[PDB]
Each structure stands twice: as C-alpha cells, then as structure tokens.
Amino acid sequence: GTKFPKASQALAQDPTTRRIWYGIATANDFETNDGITEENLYQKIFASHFGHLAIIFLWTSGNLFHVAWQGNFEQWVKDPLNTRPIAHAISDPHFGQRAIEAFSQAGASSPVNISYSGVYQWWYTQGMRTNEELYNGAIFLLILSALSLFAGWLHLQPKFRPNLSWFKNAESRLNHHLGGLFGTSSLAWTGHIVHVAIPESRGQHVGWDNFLQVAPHPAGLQPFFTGNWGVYTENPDTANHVFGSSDGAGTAILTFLGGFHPQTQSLWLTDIAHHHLAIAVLFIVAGHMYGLYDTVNNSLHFQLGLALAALGVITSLVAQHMYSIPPYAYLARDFTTQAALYTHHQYIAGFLMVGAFAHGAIFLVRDYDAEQNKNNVLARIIDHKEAIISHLSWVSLFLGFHTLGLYVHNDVVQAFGTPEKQILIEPVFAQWIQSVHGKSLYGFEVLLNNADSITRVAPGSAQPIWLPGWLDAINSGNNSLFLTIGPGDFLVHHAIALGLHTTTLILVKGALDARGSKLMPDKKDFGYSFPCDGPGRGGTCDISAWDAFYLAVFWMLNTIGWTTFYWHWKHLGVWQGNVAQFNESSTYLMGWFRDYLWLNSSQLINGYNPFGMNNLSVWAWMFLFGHLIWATGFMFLISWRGYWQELIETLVWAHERTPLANLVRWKDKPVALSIVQARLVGLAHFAVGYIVTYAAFLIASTASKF
Amino acid sequence: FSKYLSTAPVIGTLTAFFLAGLLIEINRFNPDLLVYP
Amino acid sequence: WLRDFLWAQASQVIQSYGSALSAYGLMFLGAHFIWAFSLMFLFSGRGYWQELIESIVWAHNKLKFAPSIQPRALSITQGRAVGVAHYLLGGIATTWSFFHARIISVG
Amino acid sequence: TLNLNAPTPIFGGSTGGLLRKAEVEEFYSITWTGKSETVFELPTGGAAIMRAGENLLRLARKEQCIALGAQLKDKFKITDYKIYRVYPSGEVQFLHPKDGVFPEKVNPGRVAVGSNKRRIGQNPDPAKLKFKGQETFDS
Amino acid sequence: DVAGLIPCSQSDAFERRLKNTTQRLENRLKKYEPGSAPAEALQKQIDKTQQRFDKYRNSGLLCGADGLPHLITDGRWSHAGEFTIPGLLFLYIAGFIGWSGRSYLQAVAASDNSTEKEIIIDIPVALQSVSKGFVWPLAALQEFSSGKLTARDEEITISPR
Amino acid sequence: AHTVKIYDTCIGCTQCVRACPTDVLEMVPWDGCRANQIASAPRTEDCVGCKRCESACPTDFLSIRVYLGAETTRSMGLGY
Amino acid sequence: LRHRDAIISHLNWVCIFLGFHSFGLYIHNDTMRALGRPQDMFSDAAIQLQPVFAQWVQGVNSAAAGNTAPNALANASYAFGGDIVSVGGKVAMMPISLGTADFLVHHI
Amino acid sequence: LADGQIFTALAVALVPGILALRLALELYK
C-alpha cells in the first residue's frame, strides 16, 4: 500500500502501526531486502562502512573542536594535577541563577562539564600543547570524513562498483590489512612518536611548520642503515625529569627501560615508540604469507561473528591493560576517568562478545548449509552439541551453588557476631603468578622472584634488561600494576567466572539449538527471530535463537556489573590508601551493600536537596533517570501483548465515539507492540537504564572524594 | 497409612528433617569445625 | 523519597550485623535475592528451558539413569505464578525487614 | 444470498460492536434460524434473544461469526448458521460452508490447497534457498 | 607463611578478635543479676568463644592482617584439612546419594508401572540401592569396565542436525 | 496473510480442522489410496495465526504447519 | 457487560490523567530542584497544592466534641485536631497536619 | 581560539553535510 518501508513490500502492505516499527528494525538488515542480489548486497555493505567511518571521524573531530573552543587544555597542560579537564560548555536555557553558579566550575565563567573521557591525557602525550593544534585536528578529520563520505558515494557509481570477486578475495585482504592497515600504520605511528611525541615531552616544540628541519636524534639515520642501531639507546630521561620540559631530558628515541615514568606514573614515550616499531615489523613479515574456510568466505555472518569475537576479546584487553599499565601521562592521577575508561570499554566488550555469538547463531539458521558441511570441525560441534551444552550447564551450576553458598555462609556467620568462622580461601594460584612476574610480597620465590633463576639471569645472551624498571613499579605500593589480593578477590573471581560461563551457556545453547531441538525440530525454517510456536506442545515462548541472545543480555550486564562493581570498590580503597575496607568487607555480601553501594552514594544522592544543589545535580538526576527507564523495561518484559491489544481496542472505540475527536483519524491502525518487539523494547530500556544508572553513580561517587 | 508414608513429599520431608537434625546435633556437640584437625 | 527515606532509614537494617537485629539484615538481603530470582521466571519463557533440559536429560540418558517421569519445564501460566510469588515474597519481606529493624531501633 | 434485510434479534446494546471498519471495508454477517426464543451470548457482550426467523447479526470479524456459530451448534443444536461477507464495501459472499458441507466432513469435489508432498525433516536448508525467490516450506 | 600469612597463634590481630568479643559480652553481663537465667546464657556464650579461639590457634590456621583464618587450596599436605580431607569426605557421601538414585531408577524402570514408583518409594528397592551406594567407587569401576555405565550416542534421543 | 502448509504425514483425524476459529481448513479426498483424507488450507487469507490447528494434531511432530508471514487487517484479528 | 468499553476506556483515561497529574508533579519537582529553581515546583514555599477538601474534614471532625456529638468529652481521635497525648516521654497521638506533600501522595 | 576560526569550521562542515546527503540518497536508491 504505502512506500515505507522500501526494503520490504510485505511490511509496506501492513495497515497497522507495526509497519513503522518493523520498517525501522528491518532496515539495516540488508540481506532481507527485496530483490537484493549477492553482488548488490556486498557493494551496499562497503558503502555503509564508509558512512560509519565518517561518523567516527566527525565524532572525534567534535571532541577536538569542543575542547579547543570551550575546554581548558592550555590551562590543563600547565598543571595537569590540579586542573579539571573541561568537556564542553553548558547551554541549557532551563537553568536558573544558582544552577549556573554551581556548574561554572574549573575556574570558568560559563557553566561547563568536567570531562571524564581521558581525551586530555591522550592528546597531551601525542605532543599537543595548545588549542591551535587541537583545532587543526578537527578540521583534518572533517576532510577525512568528507573523504570517507565521497568515497562511499564514489564506490556506488557504475564505473567504480567493486565486483563480487573483489570482496571475496580473502588472501589479498589479509596481506594488505596486516601489511598496510596494521603494519605500516603502526610504523607510521612510530614516526609520530619519535618525531613529535618524544620531542614535546622534552620541552621542544615540533609541528608541521618545522618538523622537516629538526632531527629526532642528534646524528640519526646514518646508524640506522649502517646497522649501529644501539646509538638510539643513549642517555634516557632521569628519575628527576619533569614531563614537558628540558630539565633532565635525554635524547634516546628507542629504548627498553620498562616500568613507568616516576612523575606522570605512566609509560615512557620512548618505550612506546620501540613497541610500535617492533609490532610494525611483525605485521609486515606476516603480511607476505598469502571445507571450513570456504564457508567462512560465503557467509557474512560467520565473518562478522568472528570479527566481533576478535574485537570483543581485545576490547576487554584494552581495559585490563590500561588500568594496570597506564599509557597516558597523568591518567593514573585522575581517578574518575580511569574508572570511566575501564567501565566503558568493559561494557562494550560484553556487547561485542554477546553479539559475536548472536551473529554466529544467525549464520547457523540462514547460512549454514549442513549438506555442504560434513565431517569438519563445524559439523562435529553440532554432532555432540548436547554434550557441550550439558557440560556448560554443569560448570555454571557448579560455580554458582558454591560461590553463592560461601557468600551466604560468610554473611550468616558475620551477622551472628562471629567473623572468625568465615571461609576465606587465599588466591594462591594467582599470588603465585604475581611472584612469577616479580611481586616479592607473598614470598613464593620462583621465576623473577628468585634472583638466581634462569628467567632473570638468561645466560644465553644476557637479554633481561626489562627487569629493573618493571620490578620497581610492581613492588612499590603506588600504582595498580598487579594489585595485592586476598580472600575477597577469590570469591568475586569465581563470580565473574560464573558469569562468563553462564553467559556463554545461554549463547552456546541458543546457537546449537537454533536449527532445531526436540521441542521444535524445524526451527531453522522460521528464521533467527520469531515470536514462538504457540501454546501447543507444552508451550514454546522464547524458543527462537534471538530470544537466547535476549536472555544472555541480562547475564552479560550482571557479569560486567560484577566486574565493574569489583574494580571500582577495590580501587576506591587503593586510591584512598585505606585498602582495609575492601579486604575485610568484600568477603560477605552485606559489605558490598553497606560499604560499597550505600556508603559511596552519600554525596551522589545529595546532588540536590531541600537546602541547595551542587555540581552533582546532573548525575543525581541521571541516577534517578536511569532507575525509571530500567524499571520501565520491566513493564514490557513482564506484561505481554494480549493484555495491551485488548486495552488498545477500548481506546480505538473511545476515540471513534467522542465528538470533536472522531473528526480526525489515524492513518495507521493502532496495535500493541509485537511479541519479539516487546522483548527488544523491554531489554533496550532495561540495558540503557542499567548502564545510565551505573554511569551516574560511578562518576559522581569517585569525583566526590577522589 | 504406611503406604502413604512412602509417597515423595512426606518421605522427602522426614529425611530432610533427619538430615537437618543430624547437622543440628553435630554442630551442637562439635562446634566451629572449619578444618579437619 | 530516595535520599531521606530509603537511604537514611535503611541505615539500621544494614548496620544490624553483630546485634539482635541481625536476622532482619539477613532477611533484608534474603529478600533482595528472591525478588531478583523472580525475574528469572518473569522475563523468560518456557521454550528456552525445555531445550536446556533436553541436553540435561541427555546426560542422564548418557549414564543410563533417566527418570521415567519425564523432566519438563514449568508451564507458561505456572512460570508466571512462580515469578509473581517470589516477586511478592521477595518484595514484601524486604519491606518487612526494613520496617522492623528501623522502628525497633528508633521507637 | 444474504436475505438482507432480516430481523436483527431483540438486543439493544453493545458498545463493543461494529465500528468504522464496517462502513469502509469488510464487515461480516451470520444468518441462522433459531427454533426457539432463547437468550444467547454474543461475541460482543451477552444476550440478545433468538428470533423464530430468519435471524441475522452483523459482526466485525469472521472470527466472531464462527465463535458465535460454534455456540449455536453446541448449546442450541441449530447447525444451519450461514456466515457471509458483504457487497460493494465488502469482498466475498457465502464464506461458510464453502462447499455446502461442514469443513470437518470430507466432500468430493474439493481440491487440496497448501499441500506438501514430504515431511518437515525433508524440507531443504535455508542456505540452499538463499538469494532465490523460492520459499523453504513451499513445494 | 605461604602468602605472607602469620599463623593464628602468633597473630596479634587474632588475639584482639578475642578481646573485644568477650568485652562485648561482659558488658552485656554487667546489667543482669549474677544468678539469673540470662546470666548463664551469656557465660555459656563466652565459653563458646573461648572454645572457638583456642581451637583455631592449635589447628594450625593462617591469619592475615585482619586476623581471620584463611584456607590454602593448592592442596598441600600440611594444609590438607582445609579442603583436601573434607573434599574426599564430601565425594563419598555425594556419590552415595548419586549411585543410590541411579541404581534405584534402573531397578524401577524394568517393572510394570515405573512411573508410580517415583511417587511411592519402594522401601525394599530403596534399601537395596543404599546397599549398592556404599560401594560406589568399587561398583562404578566395574560398571565402567564392563561397558554398562554408558550408552552409545545412537541409543540416546538426539535433536535434528 | 499467513501461510499454512499440510505435510504428507496427515492421518485424516480432522482435529486441526475442528480447532480453527476462522474456518481456514477442510478435509479433502486423498488420491494416494482414494480412501483416506488429508487436511487442506484453501482460505489462508483468513488465517489469524492462532496455531490452534497444530496443537490439535496428534502426530509426533506436526503434519500441518503455520509459518507466520505478512500481517493484514484479517491476520491481525482487528475489529477496526 | 454491554458498556464494558465505556467503563474501561474511562478508567483508562483517569489512570493516565492521575499518573501525569500526580507522579509528574514529582518529575517536575525533581527537575525544578535540580535546575536551581525551588520557586517553580509544587511545595509549601512554592506553587501550593493545598488539600482543602481534606483540611475541611479535618475541621468538621475535630470540632464535634460538644457540638454535633454533644455527649462526647473529646473528639473521635487526636488526628484531626486537638492536644498532644504523652505517655512516658513519647507521643501517643498528635494532630497529623496535611499539606502540599500530603496532597501529592494521596493522589499517588 | 579566535572568533573567525569557529565560522571557518562551520564553513568546512558543509562539505561533509552535502556528501552525507549525497551518500544517503545514493544508499537509498
């Protein structure tokens, strides 16, 4: 009937409100469009990617532009320890006079937002010092987005439309991406660090206006070709050195000091330069090297699911390594953005990993051809699918019964006035690893704690020079490089393990039963997402593979929550130098309820009250805002379609029978949300609320006490 | 009535009453058993 | 309603460990648990758990001892009832515990 | 045919019946003979009184005419109900019984519409029918 | 001293967990009559703490900074009583419950109405299974070696692939 | 409208046909024996997708299958 | 049963009417308190929503001792109005005064 | 910054503003 949605004529003939909703949902699902050939499909993907890239470019141009225009970067560079980074100005007409005086902070004369994205500490390290270098980044990214947008349009034109064979030319892509995209980019990034980052950290300004004149090393590029590479490991920076000046500055550009710079409490710039140069070489060599693998190549969902899994794993990696090994100057000192950066990337990682299994299940129903897939690894995992699921079921139950059991045991025993009766297991396997890495606290005394061990001496070539810098930081109680752990850390790690196993279980069972089960032998014929199969055969709600992902989104949030809850509380004591609170209260759950949630919410909950308002009124409003939209999701998840469809019918009747309103009419007949729709809408509210509530609390609780 | 006592809820309760009261009497005479000595 | 009522007056149900009010603090967390346990039945549906059980009746058939009473998931109407029971049991007993340990300590 | 007009039963009520969909497109009518003057529930609310008739009732959906038609055969044992769908603002006369015989009874002369010459385990993979106009369930 | 943990007999913090516990009860005993029924209720309560702490000093447990006994599970034979000795104690009792109900269902299924015998428990057949459950580490080994512990995957009900 | 397919495992029990609330199904003569009956779906444009038919089929895994498709005024069960 | 759509849709309207005009007066008051505008919310030092239909019933029930229930020595309770009664050191009963905050919860 | 550098940046941003409209109406067709 109507033209919208263009992608699906069957939705376009639906006379109800369902059409718009489903037309929004089935829009970027290019595969299910009308008449879409394989060749046309791929070219659309490619072009859509250019559009996404441009948005990314515009986004970080908008962060540069707003910081240069409304931030305090120039003021921050002068004293990173005491200057609060400004995100952008505040222009909300609804503000009153006292509220403008509360958000006119960080020494500003306008209301502004204190930034917590860590962009100030990232841009500083790269060599930016003034606002005009920031603005030059924003304009350049504007062009690159316009270069991205034009290219997407360009590669859609007849003469420039890539062939199908080009997109599936796998071997050429690995070589060029590992070589070019990864290798030469990493090599280029080494170029930026030795020619700009390292000079600016030593008080010498190097910009586009002079970089072709000045040299990164006193007599560089004659030792490089003649093989005397060791000259670049000349006199490093002294422990007295103050970042951003020439006092104590050296001249080395490639080193292997290890550890962190004593003032900024972060990695040495010269150390970061060598890393990227080495990494570059590895990728360039590997980039000259180029059944199951054909079914990888014909399914876009298989590739995406593996690419989500690969991104999801390394997204978690970024979070784990940035808090313990700080790579940006003065990022360890601002505790709130370090809290924000870990939480942000861990939640993203949870979505990616869950998404990886989601697109894997889509592959099994729509792309897996079981006749062309026999006697390989894929068709063997489906062959003992019930074994895998049952074992995943056992480990979850095993982990869960006992970790919760110990917590409940400890809680009761602590409630009855007898804390000495708690069951506290020392994390000895972990504490062994810390002693294997050099932490001399537990005294296990083998590998890099034993001073005569082969791993510290290395009598083959006398290599081991990373050891002095590393050992100083891992033994000094001033950072997060292998934090001290105890009984509290043991229990939570098994809770996190419980979360990783149960979340994987839901995703694995959903994928392996996607094509069919006993309750629904022909499930694959109905696609990835369908309501159910009616009340027959006992009942079939939540039987589709999509519903399995849906249930798993609840478990990942819970899992990433327990991860972020743990990281925050532990670091909270560590940042206040009173580690005793976490160590003793985390072994029972009332400690997590009284000394973590209730205790740290004192100021946040007082962002505004009957006596006034402070610079936390936003976070306090957001905190309540999050609770309301979290709870609003429960409505769609608990109450189902039927109640609402019948209720809506009385509203249709009422509208048509009331004068002065009867006169006007809907173009789309009102109907209740769909069965699948409600799950999605409920989960979206739940998960937006889950994150928005924790973000408001995390930021405000840490910013209040530091 | 003895046939009724073999039915699952009542035979599942009195052994749950027995296995509880075993642990109630064990913790009464032998208190605070963390480890095996 | 959150700061001066639910945050401030719940300071005697969470600081109750080590006194005679401790079982209300155990019931406070004990009902927070069962309330959240209800949403496992409310947000989900039967046909997930029936196929999760199909892999668990497999491992009981694998070691040759599966019961002749065939294990089934709860019905749709029952899983609504199991969820609404633990929601009320976990919700009211949270309010039972918060009310009791407050006014015993203050009144 | 429909035998419009026919006496509507002595009802007088039901907010929940036959709104603006009926005047723009596709409302329905059920015609039966009630061999008594008994009260019967409607799909909208419950009463009217069945006439001797020639009884006729205009309903909103085909669902409600079979749900009422199942009631006349259960409680009152009058199985001569005849559902219809109207002229110009409607679509197709004489919806049930389409062959004059009730659909639970076999009748020679009907054709098998929507039959599949296989089981459901013999249905092909959706990857085998990818990027094609063929459907996974159709023969 | 395996993770920086002093033993609890030498821990100065574990002694101060004793000192404030009996001070919280002797102050709780200061208001009552000396011969009353709550008087002997707290004196028996104080002596339960004295049998708690003097048991934990001599047992060879490891106390940390807070002063609580910690368990070392990497299993060493100097710390076998924490997890290793109650671990073997659990598995026999848990395997006795497991091999009884597994052998009960195998005896029940080869009968006329096996479904009612999951409601009603045949006390001869149940006591026959707890006799087979006490010997479960010896009975499951010969059940596995003879091959009747497991079924093949062509005999189990299996979803469509 | 929804699509309702009838597979060759039908035993002509008529249960599905007598479960349908909108009279979408009927029994028709089978030619494989000229003795038994198979279910048919000649009026799928009136199918609301309730799936009452399948819930009445006695065969171990359905002989009649309803695959929900494009929704219409009739299929959404609207009186409006 | 013949006008059940008239009952439900009129009950449907009065829930959304009361949901906005009671709970939204907190969402207004959360937003006015957060935005630094305590003179724009619904309070006793702000736009007042006084319970005058209940404060009148607080007046006709607290003034019935000797007037309309003449043989009663005091009122039906001390909740509507009267003196405070103190047993030991604590209040047994005292006049529960109603205001804008009591108007807000009674419409919740 | 300067006041003229702001209007320079909004002048550049029409080039992604037109090329996004040129791409999105090409992705639509």
Next chain:
Amino acid sequence: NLPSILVPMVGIVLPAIVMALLFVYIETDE
C-alpha cells in the same frame, strides 16, 4: 553567543523539521 542561537535550532527547530520530513515520508503511497 553562538551557543544561544544554535542549541534551540537543533534542539527544537531541526527536530521539528526532520520529524515533519519523516512523517510525510511514512504516510505517502503509490
């Protein structure tokens, strides 16, 4: 100064335009 002009454009005026543009696009037909 330019904040005072732009944030009611993309806050009020520009969403009123694109909602107007999307609503006519939805309810058009061939």
